[PDB]
């Protein structure tokens, strides 16, 4: 059915205790405990009678005026006619404040509303009745309110507060007798710092749980119109903090809705950070960070290096995101999920620069004819992929990996893969690059289509023709063309269509 | 009503619960969120840590409360040791899964239970609006690791069809026996046959030793060739031969224990219809029961089922004493 | 068919999430709000998309059905003005602790046992930092703080009475009164 705070849901008996003394409480006295409603405890009854009733009074009912008349009369008796103009809600708040302050712990039937043991039991059961969200809210309340007081108050002050809570006459007398205990109490002038500390904590919490929904709505509606960088710039927040808030909001929504969180979101918001920082760590081994990816010459050493770097930075994104131009190769949601989920590491380590794809298309070759006929067609099938890569004098140069793996190269390195069914196919980009020395860097800024052209950049035909390529001078080009073009004309020995009448 | 992955939970990290969770984690290619419940959170932490280190393809979440397990999991599978724990987890606890079940949840208990318990669990699930299946698992934990288990599912046919892709991750032979409780009945029949064949194999090897056959492999070969082949005989031939040769040896322990077999057969007897004052006269079944009880009355209840060979005559002497008491 | 595949077999479907859940609210809001292409017709004056100014942001949120509580730039909390919390975070640790918690995790709190990394030592170090800040306040490098609830409760009865009857917010205002 419906379970809430008013009607406590039935919980399991084997639940662990929340407070420390109940963990050491003996089992017999644990079994002695009854199963009672929350208000059956004297502290719960006191709360329901004093504070919860006044909280309910603000709701629309019939006895509201009847009780408000009495409370207003009491307030007028307290403060002459000044409090007549005070609002009814203000009067209720004042009464609640006074009843909270005048609360005392002592003998149950001697005037005190409830005992310290009853208060401890109520606190323990109230903590037990909380779920994960309840405990999270409890910790939030602790951080908002109690933590500044603890940070600003001395252990002597805490012990004095404990003595006040227990309200033991002899123990209070013993604590007050000590001269050092009298002199070690804190000063209100120093305790005033707790106000500013609490304000700062509440300011951070307000940032989180009030600017999270707004930033989340803006970034979910129009991520390209409101990127995290723009949101941080316009709201004065930290650029990293905005993304952290978005991630936290989405993950908390998933967790409190009992849905598996979108694990791709931290990758999509910290793509650069994910590649840079997230690593697998061994036990007992201390690790370091590479300040620079390689040993290179700085761009300040030469005037041309400086110009090259500034031009590349101009052509480069400051912060690349999921919707930007380099990620336009993820047409459908299948591509989107595949790229951003469980394979982003390999997908980003495949190629350093960001290109309009992740690899190269795979095309399959044709099998050489086998004159043995069907007596040998089976022999090229096996249980494994047989991968072959060309080596030789002209192949295997690490410094020429890009030019050797360029598909538009007539002397491209030749790779073949025989599948377990005999199919001869080409190799993927990662498969081709696996044969060279590994490159373990990435580029998240430079995007080639944004390069400058026209101003200061104009490739000229004169520079290329300075080599003077002449077909009558060198005929290797004609030889390669002859090699490429078909040769079936040689068996016909002007080409003309057949004549049939 | 959003698009997400199935929340699949496993309750009970006993001996058979760990292989099921490991199989789900290994063979779930990020198609499910794996919730793992444990009475002590340390066991759930250990299981999830071992799965993560070995390499799991699905995210996991640990639980120690049935309320959280119910609020999270879309499908729940319980692999417990005895019937009392299953009954407490399903009906008796304040956060009992079946009593607090949500309209649409599917709860499958692989623990062997009694017919009355299965009937009441199915009735409560139907009243709550959820779906319940009783699928008593058959096989050792090594067989569950190999995925070659045996499941006899009784309940909703549509629910069985929907749950088939999850069963196949740790069981290859899954049989939809029929309505609710048919899996429990089939498990009872299988356990009775197992006990009877174990007693028969023990007696056969005892008489083999008496006659003088001094090799067990050469006997099991001809037995398998002939019509006297039996799975229990094939499994227990060497251990029974060794125990007969040396009575001083104490039979080892195993996952299939004498106490558990006796409990299952007691559930079968309780669910067995009566013909009035007298019970059903099954001679072989009664002899197996008496021999197993005599074996368990020697502190050997937690050992292997092969211990019955040392207490065949103990059960016979006990029966003779009980029959001579009124004579 | 939601629970029927191509072959016709019945397939498992996740149970419906709670309709009152914030995740369901976000899903419905995304599905029912106006598309991102109709928020602004004309773009910004200088090559940039609209929505960076607070007026445009408020207009967009209104079109999406959300009333922005931070109407003005100054209404943003602006956590870069904090003088005490950053020092604590820099030296000791996360004073908040449960500010970033997913589900019972990522908690920045001292250990239960105690010792050198316990609540007592943590509070002692935090109080030492607050004492340093109060020393700065006394030396005049920082403004005198206002009157707090704890400070008022600590003060003598006469001080509390006159503070309540004067409405003073600062010890300076109390001195003037």
């Amino acid at each position: 059915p419906q379970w809430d705070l008013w009607q406590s849901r039935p919980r399991s008996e084997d639940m662990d205790e929340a407070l420390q003394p109940f963990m050491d409480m003996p089992k017999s006295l644990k079994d002695r405990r009854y199963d009672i409603p929350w208000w059956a405890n004297p502290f719960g009854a006191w709360y329901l009678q004093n504070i919860l009733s006044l909280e309910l009074l603000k709701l629309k009912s019939k006895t509201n005026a009847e009780k408000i008349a009495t409370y207003r009369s009491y307030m007028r008796s307290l403060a002459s006619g000044k409090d007549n103009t005070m609002s009814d809600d203000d009067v209720i708040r004042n009464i609640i404040k006074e009843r909270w302050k005048t609360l005392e712990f002592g003998d149950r039937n001697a005037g005190y509303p409830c005992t310290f043991g009853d208060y401890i039991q109520f606190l323990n059961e109230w903590f037990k009745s909380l779920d994960e969200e309840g405990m999270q809210r409890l910790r939030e309340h602790f951080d908002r309110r109690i933590r500044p007081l603890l940070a600003v108050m001395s252990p002597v002050d805490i012990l004095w507060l404990e003595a006040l809570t227990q309200n033991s006459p002899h123990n209070k007398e013993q604590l007050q007798r000590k001269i050092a205990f009298q002199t070690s109490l804190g000063t209100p002038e120093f305790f005033d710092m707790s106000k500013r500390l609490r304000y700062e904590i509440n300011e951070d919490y307000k940032v989180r749980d009030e600017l999270g929904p707004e930033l989340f709505a803006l970034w979910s509606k129009a991520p390209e119109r409101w990127p995290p960088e723009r949101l941080s710039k316009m709201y004065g927040l930290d650029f990293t903090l905005v993304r952290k808030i978005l991630v936290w909001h989405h993950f908390k929504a998933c967790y409190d809705a009992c849905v598996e969180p979108d694990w791709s979101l931290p990758k999509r918001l910290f793509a650069l950070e994910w590649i840079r920082d997230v690593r697998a760590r061994k036990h007992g081994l201390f690790y370091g960070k590479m300040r620079f990816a390689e040993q290179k010459i700085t761009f300040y050493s030469d005037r041309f290096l400086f110009r090259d770097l500034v031009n590349r930075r101009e052509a480069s994104y400051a912060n690349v995101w999921e919707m930007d131009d380099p990620y336009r190769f993820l047409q459908t949601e299948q591509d989107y999920e595949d790229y951003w989920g469980d394979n982003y590491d390999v997908y980003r380590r495949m190629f350093p620069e960001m290109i309009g794809r992740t690899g190269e298309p795979v095309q399959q070759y044709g099998q050489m004819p086998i004159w043995a006929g069907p007596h040998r067609q089976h022999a090229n099938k096996s249980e494994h992929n047989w991968m072959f890569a060309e080596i030789g004098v002209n192949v295997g140069h690490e410094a020429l990996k890009k030019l050797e793996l360029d598909p538009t190269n007539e002397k491209r390195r030749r790779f073949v893969i025989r599948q377990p069914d005999g199919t001869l196919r080409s190799a993927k980009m990662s498969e081709m690059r696996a044969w060279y020395w590994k490159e373990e860097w990435a580029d998240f800024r430079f995007w080639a289509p944004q390069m400058e052209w026209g101003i200061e950049n104009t490739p000229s035909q004169e520079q290329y023709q300075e080599h003077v390529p002449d077909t009558t001078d060198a005929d290797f080009r004609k030889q390669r063309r002859i090699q490429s073009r078909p040769v079936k004309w040689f068996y016909e020995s002007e080409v003309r269509w057949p004549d049939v009448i | 009503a959003i698009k997400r992955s199935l929340n699949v939970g496993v309750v009970g990290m006993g001996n058979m619960g760990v292989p099921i969770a490991r199989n789900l984690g290994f063979k779930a290619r990020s198609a499910m969120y794996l919730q793992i419940h444990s009475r002590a959170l340390s066991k759930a932490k250990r299981v999830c840590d071992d799965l993560s280190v070995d390499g799991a393809t699905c995210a996991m979440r640990i639980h120690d409360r049935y309320s959280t397990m119910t609020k999270w999991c879309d499908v729940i599978v319980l692999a417990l040791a005895d019937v009392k724990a299953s009954r407490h987890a399903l009906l008796e606890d304040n956060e009992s899964l079946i009593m607090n079940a949500r309209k649409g949840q599917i709860i499958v208990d692989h623990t062997t239970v009694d017919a009355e318990t299965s009937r009441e669990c199915a009735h409560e699930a139907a009243r709550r609006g959820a779906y319940f299946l009783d699928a008593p698992m058959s096989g050792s934990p090594r067989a569950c690791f190999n995925g070659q288990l045996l499941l006899m599912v009784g309940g909703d046919a549509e629910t069985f069809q929907k749950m088939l892709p999850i069963f196949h991750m740790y069981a290859d032979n899954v049989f939809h026996m029929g309505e609710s409780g048919s899996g429990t009945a089939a498990k009872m029949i299988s356990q009775a046959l197992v006990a009877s064949h174990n007693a028969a194999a023990a007696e056969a090897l005892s008489m083999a030793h008496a006659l003088g056959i001094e090799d067990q492999s050469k006997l099991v070969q001809v037995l398998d060739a002939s019509w006297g082949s039996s799975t229990m005989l094939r499994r227990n031939a060497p251990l029974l031969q060794d125990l007969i040769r040396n009575p001083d040896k104490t039979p080892p322990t195993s996952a299939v224990s004498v106490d558990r077999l006796l409990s299952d057969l007691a559930h079968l007897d309780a669910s067995l219809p009566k013909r009035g004052g007298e019970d059903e006269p099954f001679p072989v079944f009664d002899a197996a029961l008496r021999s197993l009880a005599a074996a368990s009355d020697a502190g050997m209840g937690d050992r292997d089922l092969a211990s019955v060979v040392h207490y065949i005559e103990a059960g016979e002497a006990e029966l003779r004493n009980r029959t001579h008491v009124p004579l | 068919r939601a629970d029927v595949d191509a072959e016709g077999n019945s397939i498992l479907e996740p149970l419906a999430v709670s309709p009152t859940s914030t995740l369901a609210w976000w899903e419905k809001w995304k599905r029912e709000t106006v598309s991102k292409h109709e928020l602004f017709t004309e773009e910004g004056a200088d090559g940039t998309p609209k929505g960076e100014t607070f007026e445009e942001k408020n207009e967009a949120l209104r079109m999406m059905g959300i009333t922005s509580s931070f109407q003005t730039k100054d209404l943003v909390p602006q956590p870069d003005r904090q003088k005490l919390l950053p020092l604590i975070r820099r030296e000791e640790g996360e004073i908040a602790g449960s500010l970033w918690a997913m589900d019972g995790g990522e908690l920045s709190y001292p250990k239960d046992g105690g010792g050198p990394q316990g609540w007592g030592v943590r509070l002692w170090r935090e109080r030492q930092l607050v004492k340093r800040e109060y020393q700065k306040v006394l030396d005049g490098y920082r403004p005198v703080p206002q009157l707090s609830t704890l400070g008022n409760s600590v003060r003598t009865a006469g001080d509390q009475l006159d503070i309540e009857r004067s409405g003073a917010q600062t010890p300076g205002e109390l001195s003037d009164y």
Partner: peptide, 28 residues
């Protein structure tokens, strides 16, 4: 290995904070 349950955080609520904070438990 053992998870920190932070049960010492709950012990601070057993100190009658209403005496000094003047009813901080409620909404404020």
């Amino acid at each position: 290995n053992e998870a920190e349950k932070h049960h010492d955080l709950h012990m601070f609520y057993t100190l009658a904070w209403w005496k000094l904070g003047e009813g901080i438990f409620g909404v404020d």
